Scaffold this active site. Structure first.
Site, PDB file in Angstrom:
ATOM      1  N   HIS A  55       0.807  -1.165  -0.019  1.00 42.40           N
ATOM      2  CA  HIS A  55      -0.101  -0.078  -0.035  1.00 42.40           C
ATOM      3  C   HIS A  55       0.816   1.230   0.045  1.00 42.40           C
ATOM      4  CE1 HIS A  55      -3.218   2.828   2.164  1.00 42.40           C
ATOM      5  NE2 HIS A  55      -2.904   3.187   1.103  1.00 42.40           N
ATOM      6  N   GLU A 129       0.613   8.056  -3.601  1.00 42.71           N
ATOM      7  CA  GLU A 129       1.535   7.619  -2.361  1.00 42.71           C
ATOM      8  C   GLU A 129       2.782   8.397  -2.369  1.00 42.71           C
ATOM      9  OE1 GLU A 129      -0.836   5.588  -0.195  1.00 42.71           O
ATOM     10  OE2 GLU A 129       1.170   5.668   0.295  1.00 42.71           O
ATOM     11  N   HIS A 133       3.691  10.934   0.679  1.00 46.65           N
ATOM     12  CA  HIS A 133       4.775  10.320   1.622  1.00 46.65           C
ATOM     13  C   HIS A 133       6.058  10.502   1.021  1.00 46.65           C
ATOM     14  CE1 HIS A 133       1.517   8.664   3.962  1.00 46.65           C
ATOM     15  NE2 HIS A 133       0.923   8.297   2.852  1.00 46.65           N
TER      16      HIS A 133
END
Ligand SMILES: [Ca+2]
Length: 245
Positions: A55, A129, A133
């Site tokens: 993920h 993502e 992040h």
């Protein structure tokens, strides 16, 4: 290549977030969310451990950022888009392809796709993502996604991954899952793992593993993990969700 922050590197841990992909798809179905292409067919696979997918890889709250009135909640919600810093553009879950292409090499993109079914195409999980992040740390996308891929492999091939495969579709106990993790990684590191479940009977949807920030580039060992106080919402026993709704 080595994963290294160019700024904001003063965080304690990365959280490796692994989906139990069948359970993820199950939960989206159960909550009447629009079906994702990654989920549509409910495709079976020979090595059931391959349902453990990537993920994300999530840096913790940098101390520089914390100093500016940012707490854990805000950091979890916004990541690189936290205000007042790093205040990079927000990644929207509803429009993941609106985040920038990451610039990952074709080789990395193909390796990533194998273990992150939602990467690329018109799905773009990896764009979202990286935007949330990675972008504010200046991570090299190849190093970043390559690390995710490698870590996912290490977990999959460990006794933890074998436990998920061996107990595919079955009810398992946290006791036995923890013993499996401990076999590979040490009893002291069981608490580095947070398990998320959904539904009733409850089934596995996500495994989050806390890794020391200074250990991210080494293969995982008993010294790599940062135990944490939160075991997750799975309770004492839960189902290793099977493909199909
Ligand atoms: Ca299922």
């Amino acid at each position: 290549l080595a994963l290294q922050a160019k700024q904001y590197g003063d965080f304690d841990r990365y959280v490796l977030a692994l989906s139990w992909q069948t359970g993820f798809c199950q939960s989206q179905h159960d909550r009447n969310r629009n079906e994702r292409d990654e989920c549509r067919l409910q495709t079976e696979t020979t090595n059931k451990a391959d349902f453990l997918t990537v993920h994300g890889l999530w840096p913790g709250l940098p101390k520089s950022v914390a100093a500016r009135g940012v707490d854990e909640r805000r950091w979890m919600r916004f990541g690189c888009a936290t205000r007042p810093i790093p205040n990079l553009p927000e990644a929207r879950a509803s429009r993941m392809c609106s985040s920038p292409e990451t610039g990952l090499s074709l080789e990395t993109a193909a390796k990533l796709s194998e273990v992150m079914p939602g990467a690329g195409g018109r799905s773009c999980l990896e764009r979202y993502e990286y935007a949330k992040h990675g972008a504010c740390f200046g991570f090299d996308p190849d190093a970043y996604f390559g690390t995710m891929v490698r870590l996912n492999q290490e977990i999959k091939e460990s006794e933890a991954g074998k436990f998920l495969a061996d107990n595919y579709g079955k009810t398992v106990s946290r006791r036995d899952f923890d013993a499996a993790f401990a076999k590979s990684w040490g009893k002291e590191n069981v608490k580095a793992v947070k398990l998320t479940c959904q539904g009733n009977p409850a089934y596995l949807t996500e495994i989050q593993i806390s890794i020391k920030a200074d250990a991210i580039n080494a293969p995982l060992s008993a010294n790599s993990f940062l135990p944490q106080p939160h075991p997750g919402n799975c309770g004492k026993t839960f189902v290793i969700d099977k493909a199909g709704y």
